[PDB]
Amino acid sequence: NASSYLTSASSLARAYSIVIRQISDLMGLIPKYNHLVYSQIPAAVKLTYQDAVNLQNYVEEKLIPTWNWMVSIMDSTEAQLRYGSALASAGDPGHPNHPLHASQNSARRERMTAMSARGDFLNYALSLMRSHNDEHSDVLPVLDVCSLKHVAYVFQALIYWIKAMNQQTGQNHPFFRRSDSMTFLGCIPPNPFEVPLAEAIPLADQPHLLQPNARKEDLFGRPSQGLYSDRNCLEVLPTKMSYAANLKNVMNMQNREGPPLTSFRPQCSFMGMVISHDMLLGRWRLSLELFGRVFMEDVGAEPGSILTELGGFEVKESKFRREMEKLRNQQSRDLSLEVDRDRDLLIQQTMRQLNNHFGPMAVHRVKVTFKDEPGEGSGVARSFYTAIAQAFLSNEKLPNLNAPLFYQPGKRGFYTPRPGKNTEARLNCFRNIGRILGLCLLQNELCPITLNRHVIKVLLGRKVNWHDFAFFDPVMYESLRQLILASQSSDADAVFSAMDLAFAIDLCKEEGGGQVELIPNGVNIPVTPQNVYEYVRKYAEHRMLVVAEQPLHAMRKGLLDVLPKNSLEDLTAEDFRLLVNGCGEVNVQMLISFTSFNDESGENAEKLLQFKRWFWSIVEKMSMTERQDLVYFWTSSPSLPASEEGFQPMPSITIRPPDDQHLPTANTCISRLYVPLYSSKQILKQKLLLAIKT
């Protein structure tokens, strides 16, 4: 509530962006002027072809210096961020001067007080003088991107204008190309054959890297840009930190009846060359990522924002959750269910009742009742969800109405359907599984059943490519990659006439039988010098799409019975995994940030401060199976939601007056745990391990 320079600068930049958007909207109506303007309004002027060219030259002349200002500032900021990222991977992480150190957190520096003002300015000035002559080695640069809000509005306006003008086989087969969920705009994707799996798709090798705050770069590989050496400024990679040097390069590369109105087509030309917004987005990728991270609440609220279009997990999950809440509260039809705690009668009653209920849906609430057990809270539905998940994922038999439904293709913790000579019972079971996942997505709960990436991509309606095979079976993915890499060797037929592979494959026991051909005419066509890409793509689409087409279609129809075709649009496999299955493993930091610590004992042992520390040390020193049993004792679910908005009751630990006689009690429907205050840390640990087993 005080006067500041930055507030006025941001407000003036917002006004400038509004006027630039209006100018862009006015210039976009020129080729359809006589249809949209000179057919409805009684008063309009006459527009010729040469006047549009004069207007385009006028506007391109009057937006030069702000363009130079923005490009110089963004180039210097991207150079500083890229040098910081380069120095982060070449230095010692144990040093306090490292970028990935705990001392570099801004919130940790404020909490540590409970350096001087001269030293901060002296370090800023010393970083300013060293950056002029490229003398800034082994020093982290001093900058604040959060004070650059007025630059982002001008950048957004100019990208809006550029985007508005722009929009107005063997190896080169569309199976080995990544989709939009794994590429970067304006950047060259990595080579799928010459790069091993450890540094191309690190999410396939390490599935535990999926976090709600995880970046895209460390999950799908490092992109590259082919910009070096070329005389224009936009064709050279920005490596200099100085604003003056970048401004010097920008200016030096700067000053280095007729046709009908329908045929007018503007072209973007600032610096003597055609400019696309894709290479501008790829040129400043780190700055755009940080701008989307820190400037979404105000800069990202503008109409036609490029930060919202390039949003991550938190942008899409909020929109999906509010649409789910609106569609849930739109109708008032309830669903009731009665089950019992076993396997066979549980799955039989589930199939019967889910067939009887709409044998799109408009389910408002879901109520579950256990037979010969009390309880009517919201945690009973979560207990039913984890019970039906562990019942479907278990491997004993098929409980009448024969193969087990799911199997693991080679990665632990992920499942794919087994066809097993599909009758009407298996298809109805898969439709029921899809409807169960649909109601779990609708009711804001977590169903602990985990599918592979291609299984999720079939449900969402996305094309399966060669890179999805790494999430199916990684070792033979690597073996086939080495087979492609050896298929282009200089010896050629020397390695081809060694094993003499054919176009028939021996399937495993779960997939079916064996000796199944890929192409017509069967085994009599061996591997030629040039057929290997075709053999790989037919093998991949046979093992991912041909064997289990009917269960995937049944699950897609079951998911579409509850959810419409307007919510799965602009969703990905990873946020589908994060919204249904949660975060997977259980961490301590989010569980710390979710708790409330209600106090009702009234006891003042050093104002507590030691029982809570002992409790969190007990949780941090606990095995993950016991952690999942702990979380099952909180809210009757083995997994945590991805964010705070997945908890309709907030989690709560509530202390009690001290009594060393009873185990802590659980109220599942309000997500509360009443714990009595104890004395010894070992006593607390023993009581917790005895309470979690139940």
Partner: peptide, 30 residues
């Protein structure tokens, strides 16, 4: 230590610097 042991109820008054990733945390303040 330094890490808080409970929720702070978000305290309002946010500048967005806490939403920065761990790799780019040295480039933001407050």
């Amino acid at each position: 230590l330094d890490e808080p042991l409970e929720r702070t109820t978000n305290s309002s008054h946010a500048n967005g610097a806490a939403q920065a990733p761990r790799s780019m945390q040295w480039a933001v303040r407050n």
